Amino acid sequence: EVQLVESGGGLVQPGGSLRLSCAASGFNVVDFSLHWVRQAPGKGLEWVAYISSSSGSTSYADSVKGRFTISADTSKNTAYLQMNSLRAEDTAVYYCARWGYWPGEPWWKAFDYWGQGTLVTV
Amino acid sequence: MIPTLYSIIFVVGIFGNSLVVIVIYFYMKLKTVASVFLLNLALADLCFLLTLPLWAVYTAMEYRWPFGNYLCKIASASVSFNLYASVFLLTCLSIDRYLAIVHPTMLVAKVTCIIIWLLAGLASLPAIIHRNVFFIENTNITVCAFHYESQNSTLPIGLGLTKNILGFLFPFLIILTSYTLIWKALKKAYDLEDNWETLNDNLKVIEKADNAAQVKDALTKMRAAALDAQKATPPKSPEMKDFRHGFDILVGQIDDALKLANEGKVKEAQAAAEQLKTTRNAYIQKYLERARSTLDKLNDDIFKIIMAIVLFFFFSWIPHQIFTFLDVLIQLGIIADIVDTAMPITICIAYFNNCLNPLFYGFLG
Amino acid sequence: SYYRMGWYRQAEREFVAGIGTTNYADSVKGRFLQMNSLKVYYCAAYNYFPRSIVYYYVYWGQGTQV
Amino acid sequence: DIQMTQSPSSLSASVGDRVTITCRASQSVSSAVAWYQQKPGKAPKLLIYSASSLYSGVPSRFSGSRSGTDFTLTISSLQPEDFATYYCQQYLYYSLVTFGQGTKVEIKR
């Protein structure tokens, strides 16, 4: 029953802001790190951002650094990605992957459960 | 040249092995098991070289034996005894090296040596009970002939099979097993050592760093190295609950340093790297020093001497063993001139090793 | 196999008959079944020359007194 | 910045054939290389979580292997459900995740 669903994707004007939400069911977000991975249409997967809710540490990809803000609420086990100053390259399908915590086998199962992914276009 | 090549072997072999037996007994006394086994090996080679000039002078006169029956029996038994004693002592040397390297015993060594000499004497019993002088037809040619009667039929087949199997197959297999296990242990120790050397180098380049980009790159290399080192578990759950736990803590500290360095805080990255240096001593230093000690045994001269002796012995004896197999195939009817043509060549080169076994001591010492 | 054959006396192993030549002793003893008017013989299977210093075999056996 | 490169950009094979995808990292990443399968129009699914450790629930036909910096995904009994795209992800650290270019299995004709 463990899964991650995405919401908030849709058609928005270029240069605007987006709020992509990732709802987690069957596990606690505090025990996992939630990563956002983009995939351009007809192209491979690209890692965008991540948040470690317990530690609070977040990171971003160099292409999206300084434009995105990833946060998380542990009460509802949800993650949020806030996009500002959207561009043409940001038109892609975003997936909310879940990655465990060091040490142990949870860490070695990288992105075991992905999200459904939402398409955003400019 | 076979009659004269033997003369060369006796000159070098007696001079070499007599120095070797003194060195392993006086200059470097019997302080280790391998010293006892090398002393016994030198004694066996001396025992064979004592009877070698008999074969040399017998081949000098176009294969005719001037001595009595007892000299013929002694020489043949000495050939067989040298083969078996050498192979058994070499296998015991390989087993001792495997135990020393992988599992870090004098009375047992002496018992093993006397048992080896007893077994080699027992295996040379057919040659010391059947060999006898034999006048060749109406001429005066007398040779050291093997007389196997109807009761003991197919005895030469059995002796050839024993030489090829007990004297070459089991020793080769046991030595290959011991040395491949040794190489496995060396590979694990070298993996651990190399990974920790890369970790130390990247730690040092972290210490002398200016911006966070170099710190991030060095921490990346350190994390990869630590993950690789955690895989290289020492050969032979008290250990796994401590080796893996130590490396889990290490990579956790690397992750803390990476978290601090990504934010742009260089000084906290340096501090976390120093805490990693502290953690090395608590959990990983014992296995590091164990791996270093295991790798130290390769630069040991005695390991190189033993490996060179084993390799050269088997290279020298391969032609004689395969030609004995061909000859027993011919005798058994399964299968010719070339087999007999190079038989003296094989018997000469097989026992040529006793000539230059001391030379290894003079090159790898 | 294919060894040189022979016959020896044990009145010792005194060489009598040697065949593949016919180098007999100082007695006639027929030729290659001996002389039946004579006043244990061993069949020896030995190679002509030693292949090596060690390789030289003799089969003997076939003890048959006349 | 560790870059993953896949040699077989396009792969075509028939049912029951054996295929192999090779992925090379810009530097040593230990056994931190996962293999994912993505069907067209669907989210990727993890197949191999270590370099050579099979994820639970996936068919046993998939295998992985590590040789230094060469990571190989091997499929032996190619059933008709293996015609999707395959990605190698170096996941050495959370902020160091890099996926490969991709490799799609097509029907050989």
XYZ file of C-alpha atoms in Angstrom:
662
model
C 0.000 0.000 0.000
C 3.111 2.181 0.076
C 3.010 4.784 -2.685
C 3.707 8.402 -3.583
C 1.266 10.538 -5.569
C 1.862 13.890 -7.250
C -0.441 16.893 -7.518
C -0.383 20.487 -8.708
C 0.931 19.847 -12.211
C -0.749 21.562 -15.120
C -0.520 24.151 -17.860
C 0.879 27.449 -16.558
C 2.306 30.504 -18.266
C 6.098 30.827 -18.596
C 7.843 32.881 -15.941
C 5.266 32.000 -13.280
C 5.307 29.891 -10.134
C 4.270 26.284 -9.537
C 3.602 24.246 -6.393
C 4.075 20.516 -6.986
C 2.917 18.451 -4.014
C 3.929 14.861 -3.259
C 1.722 12.879 -0.873
C 3.169 9.740 0.718
C 1.103 6.778 1.922
C 2.220 3.658 3.763
C 5.390 5.134 5.279
C 6.624 8.098 7.295
C 8.382 10.912 5.442
C 10.617 11.450 8.487
C 12.240 8.063 7.787
C 12.994 8.739 4.104
C 14.349 11.442 1.825
C 12.041 12.696 -0.910
C 13.724 13.502 -4.225
C 12.284 15.262 -7.263
C 13.459 13.928 -10.633
C 12.409 15.533 -13.912
C 12.099 13.838 -17.299
C 11.806 15.965 -20.421
C 9.485 14.648 -23.159
C 11.387 12.196 -25.329
C 14.441 12.392 -23.064
C 16.031 10.725 -20.064
C 15.643 11.299 -16.349
C 17.277 14.305 -14.684
C 17.635 14.756 -10.931
C 16.147 18.080 -9.789
C 16.096 18.373 -6.004
C 15.808 16.502 -2.725
C 14.809 17.043 0.883
C 15.789 15.046 3.964
C 12.897 15.881 6.275
C 14.541 14.639 9.481
C 17.807 16.521 8.947
C 16.109 19.388 7.107
C 18.907 19.509 4.530
C 17.940 20.146 0.913
C 19.935 20.235 -2.303
C 19.272 21.228 -5.899
C 20.646 20.480 -9.333
C 22.931 23.091 -10.856
C 20.457 23.756 -13.672
C 17.644 24.486 -11.182
C 19.717 25.894 -8.314
C 18.498 29.237 -7.013
C 15.046 28.960 -8.608
C 13.354 26.076 -6.761
C 12.428 25.718 -3.091
C 11.763 22.218 -1.756
C 10.063 21.818 1.624
C 8.181 19.129 3.518
C 5.458 18.793 6.136
C 5.830 15.717 8.335
C 2.329 16.017 9.823
C 0.714 14.913 6.544
C 3.828 13.142 5.177
C 3.976 15.495 2.194
C 6.685 17.211 0.164
C 6.412 20.427 -1.829
C 8.432 21.874 -4.700
C 8.025 25.593 -5.417
C 9.162 26.718 -8.866
C 9.800 30.374 -9.682
C 10.780 31.973 -12.996
C 9.822 28.979 -15.112
C 11.618 28.450 -18.420
C 11.184 26.376 -21.569
C 13.421 23.561 -20.308
C 11.268 23.063 -17.194
C 8.501 21.583 -19.378
C 8.768 17.978 -18.204
C 7.230 15.213 -16.104
C 8.232 15.416 -12.439
C 8.496 12.278 -10.297
C 8.672 12.151 -6.498
C 11.093 9.351 -5.667
C 11.725 7.988 -2.176
C 15.217 7.082 -0.978
C 16.155 5.519 2.352
C 18.655 6.547 5.023
C 22.210 5.491 5.737
C 23.152 2.960 7.034
C 21.689 -0.337 5.892
C 19.732 -1.742 2.981
C 17.200 1.143 2.962
C 19.951 3.358 1.549
C 21.065 0.821 -1.061
C 17.527 0.600 -2.498
C 17.824 3.893 -4.334
C 14.446 5.260 -5.423
C 12.680 1.976 -4.755
C 9.227 3.610 -4.903
C 8.700 6.407 -7.419
C 5.717 8.698 -7.779
C 3.179 8.796 -10.583
C 4.678 12.012 -11.958
C 2.929 15.189 -13.104
C 3.498 16.973 -16.410
C 4.237 20.709 -16.375
C 4.362 22.791 -19.557
C 5.119 26.441 -20.260
C 76.532 -33.645 -22.900
C 74.356 -35.453 -20.369
C 77.472 -37.069 -18.804
C 79.150 -33.661 -18.535
C 76.053 -31.653 -17.590
C 75.750 -33.863 -14.507
C 79.344 -32.964 -13.622
C 78.334 -29.292 -13.729
C 75.381 -29.967 -11.412
C 77.546 -31.749 -8.838
C 80.076 -28.899 -8.701
C 77.493 -26.148 -8.207
C 74.975 -28.203 -6.243
C 77.360 -29.522 -3.596
C 79.000 -26.104 -3.252
C 75.646 -24.318 -3.182
C 73.646 -26.618 -0.914
C 76.473 -26.977 1.616
C 76.502 -23.196 2.025
C 72.693 -23.220 2.136
C 72.494 -25.870 4.852
C 74.993 -23.929 6.978
C 73.187 -20.599 6.526
C 69.800 -22.016 7.540
C 71.426 -23.707 10.550
C 73.976 -21.148 11.802
C 73.501 -17.643 10.379
C 69.686 -17.821 10.438
C 69.075 -20.682 12.853
C 65.911 -22.797 12.954
C 63.621 -20.065 14.268
C 60.710 -20.715 11.874
C 58.931 -23.745 10.440
C 59.831 -22.722 6.893
C 63.488 -22.686 7.941
C 63.142 -26.308 9.081
C 61.484 -27.290 5.805
C 64.122 -25.488 3.724
C 66.860 -27.192 5.752
C 65.256 -30.564 5.027
C 64.931 -29.651 1.345
C 68.625 -28.770 1.152
C 69.501 -32.030 2.917
C 67.403 -34.027 0.439
C 69.054 -32.271 -2.499
C 72.468 -33.031 -0.984
C 71.492 -36.684 -0.573
C 70.523 -36.889 -4.241
C 73.644 -35.032 -5.387
C 75.786 -37.532 -3.480
C 74.581 -40.294 -5.824
C 74.462 -38.037 -8.891
C 78.149 -38.589 -9.881
C 77.417 -42.317 -10.080
C 74.850 -41.561 -12.780
C 77.270 -39.117 -14.412
C 80.069 -41.677 -14.700
C 77.587 -44.378 -15.744
C 76.384 -42.188 -18.618
C 79.964 -41.186 -19.468
C 80.854 -44.728 -20.578
C 77.874 -45.113 -22.956
C 75.503 -46.580 -20.347
C 77.562 -49.263 -18.634
C 77.723 -49.670 -14.866
C 81.173 -50.302 -13.322
C 79.939 -50.450 -9.715
C 78.219 -53.270 -7.838
C 74.544 -53.999 -7.389
C 74.269 -51.944 -4.199
C 75.435 -48.755 -5.907
C 72.767 -49.260 -8.582
C 70.044 -49.799 -5.990
C 71.222 -46.792 -3.974
C 71.284 -44.503 -7.011
C 67.815 -45.488 -8.245
C 66.314 -45.256 -4.759
C 67.976 -41.852 -4.394
C 66.322 -40.616 -7.589
C 62.871 -41.714 -6.408
C 63.518 -40.475 -2.867
C 64.567 -37.053 -4.128
C 61.376 -36.709 -6.155
C 59.046 -37.677 -3.313
C 60.866 -35.868 -0.502
C 61.066 -32.679 -2.564
C 57.383 -32.681 -3.496
C 56.236 -33.411 0.066
C 58.514 -30.762 1.574
C 57.312 -28.216 -0.991
C 53.661 -28.962 -0.205
C 54.359 -28.584 3.512
C 56.132 -25.291 2.778
C 53.114 -24.031 0.834
C 50.712 -25.102 3.589
C 52.886 -23.387 6.200
C 52.962 -20.172 4.165
C 49.185 -20.316 3.756
C 48.711 -20.737 7.505
C 51.186 -17.944 8.270
C 49.598 -15.460 5.862
C 45.920 -16.306 6.358
C 45.822 -17.677 9.936
C 48.479 -15.780 11.912
C 54.919 -25.371 15.986
C 58.490 -26.711 15.974
C 58.120 -30.241 17.341
C 55.273 -30.791 14.883
C 57.559 -29.469 12.128
C 60.287 -31.959 13.076
C 57.702 -34.749 13.222
C 56.467 -33.703 9.778
C 60.007 -33.760 8.384
C 60.815 -37.204 9.782
C 57.454 -38.494 8.521
C 58.233 -37.036 5.087
C 61.611 -38.775 5.014
C 59.964 -42.026 6.140
C 57.292 -41.789 3.430
C 59.888 -40.956 0.774
C 61.962 -43.941 1.876
C 58.895 -46.175 1.692
C 58.040 -44.872 -1.784
C 61.581 -45.724 -2.931
C 61.238 -49.306 -1.685
C 60.509 -50.825 -5.149
C 63.687 -49.287 -6.562
C 65.704 -50.506 -3.556
C 64.218 -54.018 -3.743
C 64.111 -54.713 -7.515
C 67.015 -52.811 -9.098
C 69.989 -55.058 -9.803
C 72.983 -55.170 -12.109
C 72.420 -57.018 -15.377
C 75.000 -58.240 -17.889
C 73.778 -57.246 -21.359
C 73.993 -60.336 -23.606
C 77.405 -61.843 -24.381
C 79.086 -58.430 -24.128
C 80.445 -57.024 -20.867
C 77.929 -54.160 -20.726
C 76.424 -54.084 -17.229
C 73.542 -51.739 -16.407
C 71.342 -50.778 -13.454
C 68.312 -52.773 -14.567
C 64.850 -53.116 -13.040
C 63.800 -56.764 -12.688
C 60.027 -57.187 -12.359
C 58.904 -60.817 -12.501
C 55.560 -62.372 -13.446
C 54.229 -62.091 -9.880
C 54.826 -58.313 -9.862
C 53.609 -57.713 -13.415
C 52.643 -54.158 -14.427
C 54.765 -52.824 -11.559
C 56.479 -50.210 -13.803
C 53.010 -48.997 -14.795
C 52.136 -48.583 -11.127
C 55.378 -46.769 -10.340
C 54.884 -44.384 -13.256
C 51.308 -43.704 -12.170
C 52.483 -43.039 -8.608
C 55.146 -40.627 -9.869
C 52.643 -38.794 -12.078
C 49.813 -38.713 -9.511
C 51.184 -38.904 -5.972
C 54.364 -37.054 -6.916
C 52.938 -34.486 -9.270
C 49.137 -34.262 -9.233
C 48.353 -34.063 -5.513
C 51.293 -31.703 -4.778
C 50.384 -29.449 -7.705
C 46.736 -29.306 -6.641
C 47.508 -28.640 -2.970
C 50.068 -25.953 -3.810
C 47.655 -24.314 -6.259
C 44.916 -24.359 -3.612
C 47.176 -22.843 -0.956
C 48.560 -20.169 -3.269
C 45.159 -19.197 -4.672
C 43.841 -18.825 -1.117
C 46.933 -16.745 -0.332
C 46.229 -14.574 -3.372
C 42.593 -14.185 -2.306
C 43.680 -12.970 1.135
C 46.237 -10.632 -0.436
C 43.580 -9.234 -2.765
C 41.226 -8.478 0.125
C 44.015 -6.880 2.165
C 45.154 -4.821 -0.826
C 41.588 -3.685 -1.533
C 41.226 -2.450 2.044
C 44.651 -0.792 1.982
C 44.168 0.921 -1.384
C 40.731 2.228 -0.433
C 42.063 3.626 2.815
C 45.047 5.193 1.045
C 42.677 7.002 -1.317
C 40.595 8.037 1.697
C 43.684 9.424 3.456
C 44.841 11.285 0.338
C 41.440 12.907 -0.090
C 41.355 13.752 3.621
C 44.706 15.505 3.230
C 43.533 17.462 0.186
C 40.458 18.394 2.223
C 42.687 19.799 4.964
C 44.596 22.015 2.506
C 41.535 23.353 0.704
C 40.309 26.838 -0.186
C 36.755 26.621 -1.572
C 33.901 24.173 -1.089
C 34.138 22.711 -4.607
C 37.434 20.951 -3.877
C 36.053 19.842 -0.508
C 32.951 18.406 -2.186
C 35.008 16.539 -4.794
C 37.366 15.118 -2.174
C 34.434 14.075 0.021
C 32.854 12.348 -2.982
C 36.038 10.369 -3.590
C 36.281 9.596 0.134
C 32.702 8.315 0.266
C 33.270 6.066 -2.737
C 36.488 4.763 -1.171
C 34.825 4.099 2.192
C 31.944 2.238 0.547
C 34.476 0.141 -1.378
C 36.527 -0.554 1.761
C 33.442 -1.693 3.671
C 32.946 -4.351 0.989
C 36.468 -5.758 1.476
C 35.780 -7.775 4.597
C 38.964 -9.385 5.964
C 39.264 -13.101 5.170
C 37.963 -14.875 8.282
C 29.198 -12.284 14.073
C 31.815 -10.455 16.160
C 33.657 -9.132 13.098
C 30.822 -8.162 10.744
C 29.011 -6.405 13.589
C 32.184 -4.341 14.165
C 33.915 -4.003 10.782
C 30.718 -3.002 8.998
C 29.600 -0.881 11.960
C 32.891 1.004 11.918
C 32.545 1.744 8.227
C 28.872 2.673 8.659
C 29.919 5.303 11.194
C 32.706 6.423 8.854
C 30.391 6.984 5.896
C 27.897 8.692 8.203
C 30.621 11.175 9.102
C 31.419 11.619 5.405
C 27.729 12.359 4.814
C 27.753 14.933 7.620
C 30.805 16.581 6.052
C 29.090 16.605 2.647
C 25.952 18.156 4.142
C 28.068 20.896 5.716
C 30.108 21.453 2.543
C 27.084 21.718 0.235
C 25.740 24.633 2.287
C 29.035 26.448 1.674
C 30.466 26.066 5.195
C 34.050 25.000 4.526
C 35.284 25.122 8.126
C 32.597 22.735 9.353
C 33.546 20.378 6.515
C 37.136 20.463 7.776
C 35.945 19.774 11.323
C 33.846 16.798 10.202
C 36.802 15.423 8.235
C 38.925 15.653 11.386
C 36.227 13.782 13.313
C 36.463 11.117 10.608
C 40.211 10.956 11.229
C 39.409 10.392 14.907
C 36.904 7.634 14.070
C 39.541 5.773 12.036
C 41.444 4.806 15.193
C 38.430 3.551 17.146
C 37.165 0.956 14.655
C 39.214 0.703 11.456
C 42.836 0.927 12.629
C 43.038 -2.686 13.826
C 41.935 -4.034 10.443
C 44.178 -1.537 8.650
C 47.227 -2.741 10.567
C 46.197 -6.379 10.076
C 45.983 -5.831 6.313
C 49.333 -4.027 6.353
C 50.923 -6.940 8.219
C 49.442 -9.425 5.744
C 50.812 -7.388 2.835
C 54.196 -7.172 4.582
C 54.713 -10.921 4.143
C 55.092 -10.472 0.378
C 58.240 -8.363 0.721
C 59.522 -11.125 3.004
C 62.448 -12.809 1.277
C 61.471 -16.297 2.453
C 58.069 -16.090 0.746
C 59.741 -15.169 -2.546
C 62.302 -17.951 -2.082
C 59.603 -20.552 -1.449
C 57.460 -19.401 -4.374
C 60.426 -19.372 -6.764
C 61.528 -22.827 -5.606
C 58.019 -24.250 -6.036
C 57.511 -22.712 -9.482
C 60.936 -23.725 -10.766
C 60.614 -27.241 -9.337
C 57.308 -27.806 -11.096
C 58.563 -26.262 -14.350
C 61.604 -28.552 -14.242
C 59.539 -31.638 -13.418
C 56.672 -31.101 -15.896
C 58.598 -32.552 -18.896
C 59.665 -35.645 -16.968
C 56.171 -36.241 -15.579
C 54.460 -35.896 -18.959
C 57.050 -38.152 -20.601
C 56.536 -40.728 -17.848
C 52.821 -40.525 -18.632
C 53.535 -41.042 -22.341
C 55.792 -44.006 -21.567
C 53.210 -45.635 -19.295
C 50.604 -45.080 -22.020
C 52.896 -46.862 -24.480
C 53.547 -49.721 -22.045
C 49.846 -50.105 -21.228
C 49.089 -50.454 -24.950
C 46.961 -47.325 -25.382
C 49.529 -45.805 -27.750
C 57.084 -43.264 -29.677
C 60.728 -42.732 -30.600
C 60.555 -39.120 -29.385
C 59.368 -40.343 -25.974
C 62.506 -42.465 -25.630
C 64.736 -39.925 -27.392
C 64.283 -37.173 -24.791
C 63.865 -39.436 -21.746
C 67.493 -38.839 -20.631
C 66.957 -35.147 -21.399
C 63.911 -35.097 -19.123
C 65.641 -36.994 -16.319
C 68.595 -34.597 -16.540
C 66.595 -31.359 -16.561
C 64.189 -32.604 -13.882
C 67.024 -32.986 -11.372
C 68.827 -29.882 -12.631
C 66.882 -27.842 -10.062
C 69.109 -29.110 -7.241
C 71.920 -27.300 -9.049
C 70.327 -23.862 -8.715
C 68.013 -24.151 -5.718
C 70.798 -22.426 -3.704
C 71.002 -19.684 -6.344
C 67.540 -18.431 -5.380
C 68.842 -17.903 -1.845
C 71.671 -15.928 -3.434
C 69.289 -13.809 -5.526
C 66.181 -13.390 -3.352
C 68.021 -13.254 -0.021
C 56.438 -54.233 -25.174
C 58.517 -55.112 -28.257
C 61.492 -56.013 -26.069
C 64.451 -58.200 -26.969
C 63.887 -61.777 -25.797
C 66.316 -64.250 -24.283
C 66.895 -67.427 -22.302
C 69.232 -67.844 -19.321
C 70.486 -70.763 -17.231
C 70.370 -71.025 -13.432
C 72.764 -73.888 -12.721
C 73.572 -67.147 -11.562
C 71.654 -66.254 -14.738
C 74.152 -67.630 -17.243
C 73.327 -66.188 -20.659
C 72.469 -68.795 -23.284
C 70.054 -67.574 -25.963
C 69.620 -64.014 -27.181
C 67.258 -63.204 -30.054
C 65.490 -60.144 -31.416
C 70.814 -61.496 -33.484
C 71.591 -65.038 -32.299
C 74.508 -64.553 -29.913
C 74.488 -67.930 -28.188
C 76.869 -69.167 -25.498
C 79.634 -71.749 -25.984
C 76.888 -74.377 -26.540
C 74.799 -75.162 -29.618
C 71.363 -75.351 -27.958
C 69.630 -75.357 -31.330
C 68.559 -72.027 -32.792
C 65.520 -69.763 -32.981
C 63.183 -76.648 -29.181
C 66.777 -76.782 -27.965
C 69.047 -79.796 -28.435
C 67.201 -82.766 -26.919
C 70.387 -84.849 -26.524
C 71.895 -82.485 -23.938
C 73.603 -84.026 -20.902
C 65.665 -73.781 -15.319
C 65.448 -71.351 -18.244
C 64.100 -67.819 -17.796
C 62.567 -65.726 -20.578
C 64.193 -62.282 -20.349
C 62.520 -59.285 -22.004
C 65.140 -56.521 -21.897
C 65.645 -53.500 -24.123
C 68.827 -53.312 -26.184
C 70.071 -50.075 -24.590
C 68.956 -48.080 -21.534
C 66.562 -45.332 -22.579
C 67.745 -43.205 -19.649
C 70.020 -43.683 -16.643
C 67.056 -45.206 -14.787
C 64.754 -46.664 -17.463
C 65.930 -50.237 -18.039
C 63.547 -53.106 -17.312
C 63.801 -56.896 -17.410
C 60.735 -59.139 -17.276
C 62.273 -62.531 -16.407
C 59.762 -65.149 -15.328
C 58.729 -68.190 -17.345
C 60.671 -70.538 -15.087
C 60.654 -73.866 -16.950
C 63.279 -76.469 -16.078
C 64.190 -78.798 -18.935
C 29.796 15.642 -10.780
C 29.884 11.982 -11.826
C 28.713 11.216 -15.358
C 27.116 7.916 -16.365
C 27.357 6.837 -20.008
C 25.491 3.957 -21.655
C 26.912 2.446 -24.843
C 23.835 0.655 -26.308
C 21.703 3.704 -27.097
C 19.231 1.511 -29.008
C 18.786 -2.236 -28.549
C 16.652 -4.673 -30.545
C 16.167 -8.370 -29.818
C 13.597 -11.141 -30.088
C 11.727 -13.030 -27.379
C 13.985 -15.426 -25.492
C 17.246 -13.706 -26.462
C 19.946 -12.462 -24.088
C 20.777 -8.748 -23.946
C 23.391 -6.738 -22.069
C 23.559 -3.022 -21.241
C 26.895 -1.536 -20.157
C 27.077 1.683 -18.129
C 30.316 3.451 -17.213
C 30.802 6.082 -14.523
C 33.091 9.090 -14.780
C 34.783 7.903 -11.570
C 34.517 5.225 -8.905
C 31.077 5.143 -7.279
C 31.491 1.811 -5.443
C 28.505 -0.509 -5.965
C 26.199 2.533 -5.885
C 24.625 1.938 -9.294
C 20.930 1.076 -9.542
C 19.099 -0.202 -12.620
C 15.552 1.003 -13.360
C 13.058 -0.020 -16.044
C 10.646 2.615 -17.370
C 7.737 1.659 -19.606
C 6.490 4.372 -21.993
C 3.995 6.566 -20.177
C 4.689 5.023 -16.760
C 6.960 5.744 -13.819
C 10.274 3.856 -13.605
C 10.586 0.725 -11.490
C 13.732 -0.252 -9.611
C 15.192 -3.543 -10.844
C 18.671 -3.718 -9.281
C 19.445 -1.749 -6.137
C 23.126 -2.436 -5.516
C 25.404 -2.810 -8.520
C 24.515 -6.516 -8.669
C 21.653 -7.104 -6.210
C 18.195 -7.947 -7.519
C 15.281 -5.942 -6.146
C 12.465 -7.861 -4.489
C 9.427 -8.651 -6.620
C 11.053 -8.316 -10.053
C 11.603 -11.465 -12.161
C 14.804 -13.382 -11.469
C 15.908 -13.218 -15.122
C 17.512 -9.801 -14.561
C 21.095 -9.802 -13.313
C 23.711 -7.180 -12.568
C 27.479 -7.172 -12.448
C 30.188 -4.713 -11.426
C 33.732 -4.677 -12.840
C 35.536 -1.608 -11.560
C 33.618 1.218 -13.222
C 31.741 -1.004 -15.712
C 28.216 -1.936 -14.607
C 26.357 -4.515 -16.686
C 22.644 -5.323 -16.713
C 21.932 -8.718 -18.278
C 18.609 -10.214 -19.377
C 18.546 -13.914 -20.264
C 14.936 -14.943 -21.016
C 13.626 -11.851 -22.791
C 9.862 -12.159 -22.382
C 7.597 -9.759 -24.331
C 7.310 -7.583 -21.184
C 10.953 -6.407 -21.350
C 10.474 -3.896 -24.197
C 10.952 -0.670 -22.248
C 13.735 1.797 -21.455
C 16.534 1.008 -19.003
C 18.445 3.529 -16.889
C 21.571 3.268 -14.752
C 21.594 5.691 -11.823
C 24.713 6.455 -9.846
C 23.421 7.233 -6.363
C 26.698 7.657 -4.484
C 25.236 10.528 -2.458
C 21.874 12.245 -2.178
C 22.921 15.349 -4.123
C 25.145 13.369 -6.527
C 22.434 11.357 -8.294
C 23.028 10.991 -12.035
C 21.010 8.849 -14.429
C 22.229 7.361 -17.678
C 21.206 8.383 -21.177
C 18.934 5.368 -21.609
C 18.501 2.109 -23.520
C 15.210 0.903 -24.997
C 14.594 -2.733 -25.930
C 12.882 -3.077 -29.309
C 11.460 -6.036 -31.216
C 13.980 -7.330 -33.751
C 12.592 -7.866 -37.249
